[PDB]
Amino acid sequence: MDSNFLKYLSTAPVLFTVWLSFTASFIIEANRFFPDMLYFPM
Amino acid sequence: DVAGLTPCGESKEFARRLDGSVKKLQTRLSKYEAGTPPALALQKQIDKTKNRFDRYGKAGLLCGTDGLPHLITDGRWTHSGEFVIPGLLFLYVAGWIGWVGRSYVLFARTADKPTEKEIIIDVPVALSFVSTGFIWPFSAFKEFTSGNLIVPADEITVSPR
Amino acid sequence: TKFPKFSQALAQDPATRRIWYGLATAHDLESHDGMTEENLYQKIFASHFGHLAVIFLWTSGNLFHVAWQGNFEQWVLNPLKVKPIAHAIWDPHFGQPAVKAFTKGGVSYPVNIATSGVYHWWYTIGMRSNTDLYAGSLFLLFLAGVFLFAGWLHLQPKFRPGLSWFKNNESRLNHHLSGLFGFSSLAWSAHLIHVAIPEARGQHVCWDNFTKVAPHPAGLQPFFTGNWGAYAASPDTTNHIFGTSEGAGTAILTFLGGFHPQTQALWLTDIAHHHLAIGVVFIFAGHMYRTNWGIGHSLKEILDAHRPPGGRLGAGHKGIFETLTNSLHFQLGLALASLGVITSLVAQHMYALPSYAFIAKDYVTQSALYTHHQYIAGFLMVGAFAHGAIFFVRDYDPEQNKNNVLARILDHKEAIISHLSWVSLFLGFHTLGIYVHNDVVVAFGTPEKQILVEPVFAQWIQASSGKALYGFDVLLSSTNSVAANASSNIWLPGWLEAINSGKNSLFLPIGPGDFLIHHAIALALHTTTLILVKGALDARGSKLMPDKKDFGYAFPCDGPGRGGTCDISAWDAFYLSMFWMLNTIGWVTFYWHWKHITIWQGNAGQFNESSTYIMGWLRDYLWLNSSPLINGYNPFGMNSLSVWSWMFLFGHLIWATGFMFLISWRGYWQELIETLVWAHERTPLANLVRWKDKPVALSIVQARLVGLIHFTAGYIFTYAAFVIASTTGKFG
Amino acid sequence: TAVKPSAQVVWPIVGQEVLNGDVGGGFQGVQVTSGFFQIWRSSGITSEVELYWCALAGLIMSGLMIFAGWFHYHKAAPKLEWFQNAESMLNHHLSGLLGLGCLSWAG
Amino acid sequence: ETLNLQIPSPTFEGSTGGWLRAAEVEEKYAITWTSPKEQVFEMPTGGAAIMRQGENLLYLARKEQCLALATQVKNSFKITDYKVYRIFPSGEVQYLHPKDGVFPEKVNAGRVGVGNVSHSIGKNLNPAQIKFTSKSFNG
Amino acid sequence: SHSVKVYDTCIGCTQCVRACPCDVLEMVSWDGCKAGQIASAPRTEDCIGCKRCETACPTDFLSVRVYLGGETTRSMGLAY
Amino acid sequence: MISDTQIFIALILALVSLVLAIRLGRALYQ
Amino acid sequence: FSPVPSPEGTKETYWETKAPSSDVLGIGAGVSSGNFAAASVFAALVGGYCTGQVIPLTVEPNPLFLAGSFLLPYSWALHVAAWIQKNNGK
Ligand code: CLA
Ligand code: CLA
Ligand code: CLA
Numbered sequence A: 001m002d003s004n005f006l007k008y009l010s011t012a013p014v015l016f017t018v019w020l021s022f023t024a025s026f027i028i029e030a031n032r033f034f035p036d037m038l039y040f041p042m
Numbered sequence B: 001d002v003a004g005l006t007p008c009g010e011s012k013e014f015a016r017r018l019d020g021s022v023k024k025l026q027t028r029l030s031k032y033e034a035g036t037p038p039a040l041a042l043q044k045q046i047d048k049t050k051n052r053f054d055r056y057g058k059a060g061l062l063c064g065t066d067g068l069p070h071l072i073t074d075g076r077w078t079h080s081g082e083f084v085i086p087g088l089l090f091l092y093v094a095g096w097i098g099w100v101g102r103s104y105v106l107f108a109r110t111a112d113k114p115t116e117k118e119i120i121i122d123v124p125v126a127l128s129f130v131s132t133g134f135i136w137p138f139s140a141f142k143e144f145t146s147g148n149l150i151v152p153a154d155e156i157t158v159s160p161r
Numbered sequence C: 001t002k003f004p005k006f007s008q009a010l011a012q013d014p015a016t017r018r019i020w021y022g023l024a025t026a027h028d029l030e031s032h033d034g035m036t037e038e039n040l041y042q043k044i045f046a047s048h049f050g051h052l053a054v055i056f057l058w059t060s061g062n063l064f065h066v067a068w069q070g071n072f073e074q075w076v077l078n079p080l081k082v083k084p085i086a087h088a089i090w091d092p093h094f095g096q097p098a099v100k101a102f103t104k105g106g107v108s109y110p111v112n113i114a115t116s117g118v119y120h121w122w123y124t125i126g127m128r129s130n131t132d133l134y135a136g137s138l139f140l141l142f143l144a145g146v147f148l149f150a151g152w153l154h155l156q157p158k159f160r161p162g163l164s165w166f167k168n169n170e171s172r173l174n175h176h177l178s179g180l181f182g183f184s185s186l187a188w189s190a191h192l193i194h195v196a197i198p199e200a201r202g203q204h205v206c207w208d209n210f211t212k213v214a215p216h217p218a219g220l221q222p223f224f225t226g227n228w229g230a231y232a233a234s235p236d237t238t239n240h241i242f243g244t245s246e247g248a249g250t251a252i253l254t255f256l257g258g259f260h261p262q263t264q265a266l267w268l269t270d271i272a273h274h275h276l277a278i279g280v281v282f283i284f285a286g287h288m289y290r291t292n293w294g295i296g297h298s299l300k301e302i303l304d305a306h307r308p309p310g311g312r313l314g315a316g317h318k319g320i321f322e323t324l325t326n327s328l329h330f331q332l333g334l335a336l337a338s339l340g341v342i343t344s345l346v347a348q349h350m351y352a353l354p355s356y357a358f359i360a361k362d363y364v365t366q367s368a369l370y371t372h373h374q375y376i377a378g379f380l381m382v383g384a385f386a387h388g389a390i391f392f393v394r395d396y397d398p399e400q401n402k403n404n405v406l407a408r409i410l411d412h413k414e415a416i417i418s419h420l421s422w423v424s425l426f427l428g429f430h431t432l433g434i435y436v437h438n439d440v441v442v443a444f445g446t447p448e449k450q451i452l453v454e455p456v457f458a459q460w461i462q463a464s465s466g467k468a469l470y471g472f473d474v475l476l477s478s479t480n481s482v483a484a485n486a487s488s489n490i491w492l493p494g495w496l497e498a499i500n501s502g503k504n505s506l507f508l509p510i511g512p513g514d515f516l517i518h519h520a521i522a523l524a525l526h527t528t529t530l531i532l533v534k535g536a537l538d539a540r541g542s543k544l545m546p547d548k549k550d551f552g553y554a555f556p557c558d559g560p561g562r563g564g565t566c567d568i569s570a571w572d573a574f575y576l577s578m579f580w581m582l583n584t585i586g587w588v589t590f591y592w593h594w595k596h597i598t599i600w601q602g603n604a605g606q607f608n609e610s611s612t613y614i615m616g617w618l619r620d621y622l623w624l625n626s627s628p629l630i631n632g633y634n635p636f637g638m639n640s641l642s643v644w645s646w647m648f649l650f651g652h653l654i655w656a657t658g659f660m661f662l663i664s665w666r667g668y669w670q671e672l673i674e675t676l677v678w679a680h681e682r683t684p685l686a687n688l689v690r691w692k693d694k695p696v697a698l699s700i701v702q703a704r705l706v707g708l709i710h711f712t713a714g715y716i717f718t719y720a721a722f723v724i725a726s727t728t729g730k731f732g
Numbered sequence D: 001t002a003v004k005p006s007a008q009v010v011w012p013i014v015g016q017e018v019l020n021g022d023v024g025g026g027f028q029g030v031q032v033t034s035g036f037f038q039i040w041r042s043s044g045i046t047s048e049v050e051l052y053w054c055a056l057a058g059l060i061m062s063g064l065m066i067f068a069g070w071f072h073y074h075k076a077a078p079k080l081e082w083f084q085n086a087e088s089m090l091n092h093h094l095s096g097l098l099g100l101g102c103l104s105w106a107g
Numbered sequence E: 001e002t003l004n005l006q007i008p009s010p011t012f013e014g015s016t017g018g019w020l021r022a023a024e025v026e027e028k029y030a031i032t033w034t035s036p037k038e039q040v041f042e043m044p045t046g047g048a049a050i051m052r053q054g055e056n057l058l059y060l061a062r063k064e065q066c067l068a069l070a071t072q073v074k075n076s077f078k079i080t081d082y083k084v085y086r087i088f089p090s091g092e093v094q095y096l097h098p099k100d101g102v103f104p105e106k107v108n109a110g111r112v113g114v115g116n117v118s119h120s121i122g123k124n125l126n127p128a129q130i131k132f133t134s135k136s137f138n139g
Numbered sequence F: 001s002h003s004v005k006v007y008d009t010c011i012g013c014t015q016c017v018r019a020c021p022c023d024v025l026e027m028v029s030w031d032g033c034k035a036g037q038i039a040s041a042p043r044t045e046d047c048i049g050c051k052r053c054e055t056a057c058p059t060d061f062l063s064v065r066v067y068l069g070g071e072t073t074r075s076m077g078l079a080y
Numbered sequence G: 001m002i003s004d005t006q007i008f009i010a011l012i013l014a015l016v017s018l019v020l021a022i023r024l025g026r027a028l029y030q
Numbered sequence H: 001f002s003p004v005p006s007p008e009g010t011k012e013t014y015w016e017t018k019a020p021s022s023d024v025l026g027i028g029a030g031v032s033s034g035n036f037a038a039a040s041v042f043a044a045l046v047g048g049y050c051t052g053q054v055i056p057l058t059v060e061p062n063p064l065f066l067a068g069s070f071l072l073p074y075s076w077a078l079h080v081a082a083w084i085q086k087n088n089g090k
């Protein structure tokens, strides 16, 4: 894959948008399978 | 119980919360036919609402006079799952993010163009750092005691006063 | 060309800026041309007498207007049903419906109902008729004149004190503790024992009969025997009707604790014994310092000796004595910080422990008094930090303060400022985060997913004082405790009755809504402190302006270079913290008033459920209680809440006009004014008239001050109109 | 007159499916106020099948415009004397764009 | 040296941006310059004027207005022949710029330094030290 | 008028003098810097306080310092 | 109730305060 | 800014030694460290005893036990004076 295109995807706004979309996405998935967790179950 | 609170499993106001929440959904369900997509959507919401109320009742949460769960955060172990353990979980992630971010800013200082490493992140090296964060409490304290976390006051720029 | 006679730099300005700046600098005597230190202290001395007379004239007018136009005598007969009158209205802009709508209070003329509580204070301390209200007004008119003459007299050449007098720290402290604080607390104990307590028991005691009416039947014989407890015998019964002889005791010095059951106020014999005890303690305190007879302390010696030997404070307080004595701004800051805390204690302890009879059934007076004194507190607290900033810029000498507590503060100012920055952000992220979580979770129909933290630490403190509401069974709440057994023969029985009735405001029940707002109030206290501390500690210099102290306290900026330096002065951090002070007192008074109006209705559960999200504050407090206020006039008529309805809109108008001075800045306005100057000169019949002062746009600093004043004035008028009209309209 | 227009349906995640209100017609969704339904009836759409063809027609146009922006910057960029033809541009934007736009829409 | 009041003025059609009553009762500023051409320039107070070939003369209300024109006349028309005068209503004409025949950014002998402080800016005196004293903060 | 000061950290770059819109500053001879020249403020009665000189100055802390003072017709930049 | 003569006593004493306030203000003004 | 006055008999009390000079003790500058230490324990015992005897406070408290109870905080200042004198060789 082109190294200048990979250097473009390594730029701060793309990584910030991708990482926080990935981060938001597994919070969303964790609340789909395991909803309404007000407390650590113990 | 604690602070004059009632366990949610025997609170009558918690019981009325669950019933009112389901009556509100059932009257919306009364306007749809059985196999329709709006009927299945609301029937799945009545199942979810009942499950949540059942779980809260059996969890050891304490309800108020208002029938809502209240959190006890004074440090007692019977209630550590409401703040102390979520907090221990948080600080592990937070220190991980902090240790990993700190490790990359120190790497980028030794670069050919240090400010280009911060707007164009060296993703293989930055991923090398994110994996290292799992033992940040040991790595950061050894960093502290080996004189590499804290810089002395006389290498820090301060205002004249 | 001669108005700023104290400033030749302003008196030679040819613009309209001279009039504005001369008015705004008039009281800053230190900056006036040719000011010596002798004259600075002598003008402050006289203008303190002049301020004192203004306070006595303000008080005499309140007494006079109530004696003349009030219904004090009718109110005294039936104090829970009559609404006290402040003064009458004579306004030729009124219509005849307005004249009728304001003719309440049992009188035949338009009047303003009083929210100040002066009726309850004057009743409790003894006043019964209009003729002793007027006698008090006459005394204050005399006292104002005596202090006006004293101010003029101590400006005369022989009566002007020397700087050695003004800086006698030990003699002034001895007299202010033992005489101004202590003896007058003792003299106020005498007034209650001789006048207020007898007239609370039906017996009139005035100048006419005081020397022949004994406060106690035994009478100054138990005092000279050590049988002091004979003065606590037969306290007022719980059947006592205040102002009358029925149910009355003979005691003058008691420690019963709790409230008089009918007035719902502290016992007058507890209050007299409070002032006797406080007065004795203060008189002893006023013997601490050495003046002329060889006993006592040198203040300089105490400060020099308090350097901890571990060396963690450096040189300690060596040289603080000279720094505080020579800096009036350092003295002012200590006084304002101390005064600011007290006026906050006054607001907190007067709603929970009221001393005046039948007040705390005056929901409007109780609300206005709290709101008034917390706002005074926030202003005093800002001023202390502002004058601490003025101290560092102007009066602080780093070479007379080598390695002090003061110099070592400035040595780790970034440690202090960054840790305020962290704690503000720490509080702000999570306090706002929980509230937004609760709002979103409640909006989606799931209020049981709210994060509701029980404020157990405060509930445990309530229980430690005997509150039997949370089952904590600790200290005073515990029946068999060393704490509970110790106070049992004195105030414990009366206090437990007072704190375990849900009929007063002593240690009000708290829950998750109270937890959340206290952490918001904590956020606002640390953030206001941050701006003010950053203003004080960066006042002398920073990295942008390392020579910031050469420019003063209030300067506009250092220009657009070095990135831009708008709001870089220490004054500008006063400016910025004023918004945060207004925000915090808003959060405090919004909380106090909503918690009280819901309790006064009998619906404390409405606060309990709706305070945990922000829409509950918006609809159940601001929107719900707005309706009596905004209906003070409408196309269907008007009532006596029409004035507050107008002040409400008036306050929104002043507040918004302040935005114009804060958002739009000078360059736009100076260029308009140049087009207006052109048009006047070119307009026939109008260019016959010429300005003496060239019209100019307001200065950069002045516009900040003008916008801040408009913002602040709009803030006060709006809330006062709301807190008074919503409480009046509801009566609950 | 009875059904409320709605063209946005939310996923059930954190209780947010309360936003799928009863807009009518055996349907749950977010009520939309942009007036597209009234446009489509004015256009004579009358079925979801034709709405899919309009959606494809937009996508093909969307691809053609991004191609033209690339093409006219990187492959075939007009010279300044092309852009400085104000009489030609006005003739075409009055006659061709606005005039044939109205005439075709009238048809 | 003195302003020759008879020097022709650049062709201008007038504007509302010119000087007001304060120029005829307090002070007025004038700028003269030599132009090799009859060319359009921009007035500091408004629109465009045309400077005549040869010697031009303007009157402005502010000293900064004369120098803002001087900057423009030297940056776009390469005229460095500009002399700025101050004129009082008493008739007194005060030569201003360049003050000694040489531009300020070029050094000249016989210029005495005003405002020069022998130490760096951080060596000033603290305000408390010079309180109730006439002593200056620059050491 | 405004008070304009030049400190002996001036490197003689003449940039303040070129940036001054009111001809307040000029260059005088010196021997304390390599350039042999220092900025001077002989005409501060004409200083309007714009601080364009301070912006132009490249020494770490400004060799030229403007201190805004009493306002006049000249220093308020009034054409009226 | 308050008589008008009593109001007039207050106006006399407040007038005495106005005269003393002027003199204190003139002394402060110098 | 002008001379700040202090009462006559003001002396210098700033110390950087192990213990302050005995001048910080005022009228007790000549008392021995043994005498403060014995007074310190005596005031602590008598003050605690008098305090203990009136913990349930009545409307008739013994005035000697009240006055004697003020010896407990006074003992704190006594052992500080005992430490100061011992470290000054008194
Ligand atoms: C009849 C001729 C004609 C037409 C229709 C247009 C149309 C347009 N020109 Mg113009 N243009 C023309 C001739 C024409 N031009 C000439 C001769 C010149 C040289 C002087 C220019 C120079 C020029 C410049 C410099 C710019 C335009 C721009 C635009 C667009 C304006 C934004 C807009 O409303 O688009 C939305 C409206 C639409 C209707 C979208 C339609 C898209 C296609 C291209 C329209 C034509 C399709 C086709 C002819 C129809 C086939 C019908 C068939 C089914 C029967 C628009 C597409 C501007 C622009 O946005 O650039 C992209 C712009 O910056 N034009
Ligand atoms: C991971 C990097 C990192 C680390 C270790 C720190 C460390 C610290 N910061 Mg933070 N800070 C950072 C990034 C970082 N900062 C960024 C990016 C900003 C801009 C928003 C700030 C803004 C900031 C302020 C305004 C304040 C601090 C404060 C502090 C101190 C206390 C902790 C705190 O308040 O956190 C607070 C953290 C934030 C407010 C923002 C953090 C935002 C993200 C989560 C961190 C950045 C992640 C980064 C992209 C890492 C990528 C790594 C990858 C390339 C391998 C501590 C010195 C406070 C202080 O001085 O108190 C003593 C303080 O007041 N910082
Ligand atoms: C016993 C002798 C004595 C007394 C009574 C005073 C009294 C006073 N002096 Mg002092 N003074 C004295 C000796 C004395 N002085 C000596 C010996 C010296 C020379 C060494 C000075 C030098 C001196 C200076 C230089 C100044 C004063 C000033 C003042 C006035 C202070 C302002 C004021 O009214 O505060 C009144 C304060 C109180 C009544 C106590 C404070 C109360 C606190 C804040 C809380 C109270 C709460 C309580 C519940 C109140 C309830 C109110 C009610 C509505 C419920 C005050 C009248 C100042 C002044 O104003 O000059 C005119 C001033 O500038 N004095």
Ligand code: CLA
Binding pocket: C421, C422, C424, C425, C426, C427, C428, C429, C432, C527, C530, C531, C576, C577, C579, C580
């Ligand atoms: C609602 C109005 C509001 C809000 C929220 C703030 C918030 C804040 N102010 Mg400001 N301020 C305001 C009005 C406001 N101010 C006004 C009117 C003034 C008068 C001019 C000031 C003057 C002022 C000064 C002078 C100071 C502050 C400070 C602060 C901070 C104090 C609270 C804190 O430390 O943590 C609270 C933190 C927050 C509220 C941040 C919110 C978290 C965000 C929303 C996360 C959301 C991320 C999200 C995905 C973004 C989406 C973007 C989208 C395009 C994708 C904070 C950043 C102080 C400061 O910065 O100290 C550190 C400070 O010194 N403020």
Ligand code: CLA
Binding pocket: B073, B074, B083, B084, B085, B086, B087, B088, B091, C423, C426, C427, C453, C454, C455, C456, C457, C458, C459, C510, C514, C515, C516, C518, C519, C522
């Ligand atoms: C700097 C943060 C901060 C600040 C300024 C305050 C301030 C306040 N709190 Mg809050 N509080 C905080 C953090 C904070 N709290 C946290 C993190 C908790 C645990 C959930 C609480 C729990 C709490 C309760 C239960 C109550 C208060 C109350 C109050 C008020 C009275 C004083 C008090 O009890 O202090 C409390 C002080 C502390 C708990 C000390 C916190 C200091 C550390 C540095 C904060 C961070 C700890 C960290 C996150 C946890 C460690 C890890 C752990 C999970 C293993 C006051 C408004 C009381 C009140 O009046 O409410 C109406 C009350 O009853 N607070």
Ligand SMILES: CC1=CCCC(C)(C)[C@H]1/C=C/C(C)=C/C=C/C(C)=C/C=C/C=C(C)/C=C/C=C(C)/C=C/C1=C(C)CCCC1(C)C
Binding pocket: C047, C049, C050, C051, C053, C054, C057, G008, G009, G011, G012, G014, G015, G017, G018, G021, G022, G024, G025, G028
């Ligand atoms: C802000 C301010 C500025 C400078 C500093 C400062 C001084 C310290 C400060 C103070 C300001 C202060 C303290 C201001 C104080 C202002 C005051 C007290 C003003 C009082 C005015 C009273 C009047 C005019 C009443 C007059 C009555 C009359 C004429 C009745 C007369 C009569 C009637 C009918 C009946 C009787 C017979 C006669 C005689 C015929």
Ligand SMILES: CC1=CCCC(C)(C)[C@H]1/C=C/C(C)=C/C=C/C(C)=C/C=C/C=C(C)/C=C/C=C(C)/C=C/C1=C(C)CCCC1(C)C
Binding pocket: C329, C330, C333, C334, C337, C338, C341, C384, C385, C386, C387, C388, C389, C391, C533, C536
């Ligand atoms: C900016 C500036 C620059 C330099 C100069 C400057 C002017 C000095 C400065 C200004 C500084 C300023 C403006 C400073 C402001 C400082 C302030 C407002 C300090 C507040 C102090 C309150 C305290 C210590 C309360 C203590 C209560 C206690 C111990 C209660 C205890 C308890 C009791 C008795 C009863 C209940 C149980 C418990 C809880 C046990």
Ligand SMILES: CC1=C(C/C=C(\C)CCC[C@H](C)CCC[C@H](C)CCCC(C)C)C(=O)c2ccccc2C1=O
Binding pocket: C660, C661, C662, C664, C665, C666, C667, C669, C670, C696, C697, C698, C699, C700, C703
């Ligand atoms: C509106 C506005 C003006 C124009 C306002 C001017 C020029 C003031 C005109 C006010 C009139 C002439 C008097 C107002 C009268 C006051 C209501 C009462 C003042 C008198 C008391 C103080 C005694 C500015 O000059 C300005 C400057 C910098 C930033 C923002 C602004 C800004 O917003």
